[PDB]
Amino acid sequence: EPQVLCYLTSWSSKRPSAGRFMPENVDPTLCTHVIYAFATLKDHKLTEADEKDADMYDKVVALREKNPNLKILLAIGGWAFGSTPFKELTSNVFRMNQFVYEAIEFLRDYQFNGLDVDWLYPRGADDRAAFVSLLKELRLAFEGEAKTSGQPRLLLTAAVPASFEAIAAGYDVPEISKYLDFINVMTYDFHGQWERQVGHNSPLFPLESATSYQKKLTVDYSAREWVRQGAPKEKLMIGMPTYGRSFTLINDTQFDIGAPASGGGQAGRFTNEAGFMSYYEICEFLREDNTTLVWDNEQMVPFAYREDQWVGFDDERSLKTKMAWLKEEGFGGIMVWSVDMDDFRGSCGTGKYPLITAMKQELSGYKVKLEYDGP
Numbered sequence: 113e114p115q116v117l118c119y120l121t122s123w124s125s126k127r128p129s130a131g132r133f134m135p136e137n138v139d140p141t142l143c144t145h146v147i148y149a150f151a152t153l154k155d156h157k158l159t160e161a162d163e164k165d166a167d168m169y170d171k172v173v174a175l176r177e178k179n180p181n182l183k184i185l186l187a188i189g190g191w192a193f194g195s196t197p198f199k200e201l202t203s204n205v206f207r208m209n210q211f212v213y214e215a216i217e218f219l220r221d222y223q224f225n226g227l228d229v230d231w232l233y234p235r236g237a238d239d240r241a242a243f244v245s246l247l248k249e250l251r252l253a254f255e256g257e258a259k260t261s262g263q264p265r266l267l268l269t270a271a272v273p274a275s276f277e278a279i280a281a282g283y284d285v286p287e288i289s290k291y292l293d294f295i296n297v298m299t300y301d302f303h304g305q306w307e308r309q310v311g312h313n314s315p316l317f318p319l320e321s322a323t324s325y326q327k328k329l330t331v332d333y334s335a336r337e338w339v340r341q342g343a344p345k346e347k348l349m350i351g352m353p354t355y356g357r358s359f360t361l362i363n364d365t366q367f368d369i370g371a372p373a374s375g376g377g378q379a380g381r382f383t384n385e386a387g388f389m390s391y392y393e394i395c396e397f398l399r400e401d402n403t404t405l406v407w408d409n410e411q412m413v414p415f416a417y418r419e420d421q422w423v424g425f426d427d428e429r430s431l432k433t434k435m436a437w438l439k440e441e442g443f444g445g446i447m448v449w450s451v452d453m454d455d456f457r458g459s460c461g462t463g464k465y466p467l468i469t470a471m472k473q474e475l476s477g478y479k480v481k482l483e484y485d486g487p
């Protein structure tokens with residue numbers, strides 16, 4: 113019963129040349145769920161973010177025609193979106209409920225299998241309560257619709273932060289765990305171009321020399337914080353990045369964890385964002401001349417540097433290491449950000465979709481089983 117939820121980013125279709133990704137590029141057998149990101153709120157109603165999206169919806173659905181057990185979800189929100197439309201969505205009950213009732217129709221019309229809520233992020237007591245009510249209402253209406261109609265219930269999932277501080281700030285974990293089908297923990301973006309020291313995007317474990325605060329910025333500590341706060345393991349989907357985060361070094365001779373950095377490193381040719389690289393862009397950086405590939409034995413993740421360019425990322429080995437940690441802890445499955453940034457063309461020299469394949473094969477035979485695991 114382990115689940116693999118893969119995000120598909122709409123804007124990946126705007127990629128140039130090989131980087132261009134369409135719903136048809138998705139292997140219908142890789143993931144258990146596909147989540148399309150993002151839809152938006154216009155007049156407090158679940159709505160297309162762009163007319164080009166309507167047909168995109170039609171194409172991400174009907175991946176079901178090559179795999180009928182594949183579930184397709186639509187995500188609302190995201191970072192660009194902001195926290196304000198969610199505050200106004202949950203300000204009064206009518207708009208809230210009318211949002212739910214019409215969202216159900218919207219989803220059923222497109223024949224989605226459910227909804228992913230990406231409010232990034234609720235903050236403060238009033239936001240906490242409103243996030244719970246939104247989730248509660250969606251869940252009860254999904255159940256209620258499943259009985260007043262005829263078909264199996266729409267799925268409810270949400271993307272949630274890894275930061276232990278953001279958890280306390282915005283998430284009543286026992287309550288949201290009642291109504292969510294899956295809790296997608298964003299166990300990445302622990303470090304990046306907003307910092308002036310080199311650090312890894314998604315380290316599994318911390319360095320022994322790390323401060324007590326730095327030790328909390330890991331996949332292992334974050335996932336366990338969610339458990340500690342009451343999230344049920346079988347609903348916890350641990351996030352796996354198919355991308356890396358890069359730095360421009362102050363000094364070429366200092367390339368170790370914590371070396372000074374002036375900002376993000378040179379953008380990739382396809383994602384066009386400094387401080388950021390997709391995995392197939394990582395490989396291009398890796399086969400350049402004189403690039404040093406390093407394996408961090410403590411953090412159990414790779415990184416690489418060449419001249420003043422430094423990038424920390426995830427490969428086959430780190431993701432396999434993570435699946436072993438996953439099974440050991442007994443989590444319900446994984447979430448992948450994102451399917452369009454795996455090497456979906458096989459240009460790395462390994463197989464097509466190498467990162468997700470490596471995770472899938474390592475989860476083979478795994479079945480989630482709940483058991484007491486101490487304080």
Ligand SMILES: *[C@@H]1O[C@H](CO)[C@@H](O)[C@H](O)[C@H]1NC(C)=O
Pocket residue numbers: 363364365366
């Ligand atoms: C780079 O680092 C070394 C010591 O690690 C320092 O002596 C050197 O001056 C630095 N380079 C520059 C241009 O400052």
